[PDB]
Design a protein around this ligand. Structure first.
Ligand code: HEM
Length: 153
């Protein structure tokens, strides 16, 4: 599992994320969209945005970035005991949104990139390693629920 010390590192950086969720969530989604364009085509509500300027301009994209980080935050503060929060997310993303497990890896890279940008002195190699373990645990449990449903990535 993650140690209690690695969970400390994770949540100490997330409390800073919580001081500007809407800004963090918008940067993360933008980074996902540009680095991996195919993920934007999964969003009927965002599929119209072509440039980074248009993305930055959209209130609705910002609204959805808040939705995602709030849901991720609820999960991370359970420190691994997240069965009830994670189960509905896997179900929706499996059966309704149809999101390949690989795209959950892409958004995980996006989160880490943005956390490094916004919090250097605060997001050293050790905190980077803890956060990547926590995201791999996230991915690992959703993947298990996907397999059960017939979608395995
Ligand atoms: C940490 C990663 C993610 C979290 C925490 C997350 C969370 C959520 C939440 C809470 C919702 C709204 C309720 C729901 O539909 O069940 C949602 C909706 C949605 N998510 Fe995710 N999501 C994540 C990653 C992704 C990725 C990587 C994609 C696509 C590449 C994706 C696509 C969607 C879509 C298409 C919706 C519906 C948007 C709309 O039309 O209203 N999600 N997500």
């Amino acid at each position: 599992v993650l140690s209690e010390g690695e969970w400390q590192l994770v949540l100490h950086v997330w409390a800073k994320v919580e001081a500007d969720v809407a800004g963090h969530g918008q940067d993360i989604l933008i980074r996902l969209f540009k680095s991996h364009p195919e993920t934007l085509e999964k969003f009927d509500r965002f599929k119209h945005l072509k440039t980074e300027a248009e993305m930055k301009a959209s209130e609705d994209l910002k609204k959805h970035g808040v939705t995602v980080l709030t849901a991720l935050g609820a999960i991370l503060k359970k420190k691994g005991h997240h069965e009830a929060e994670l189960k509905p997310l896997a179900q929706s993303h499996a059966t309704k949104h149809k999101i390949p497990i690989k795209y959950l890896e892409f958004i995980s890279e996006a989160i880490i990139h943005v956390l490094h940008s916004r919090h250097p002195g605060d997001f050293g190699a050790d905190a980077q390693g803890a956060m990547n373990k926590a995201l791999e645990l996230f991915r690992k449990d959703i993947a298990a629920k996907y397999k059960e449903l017939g979608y395995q990535g």
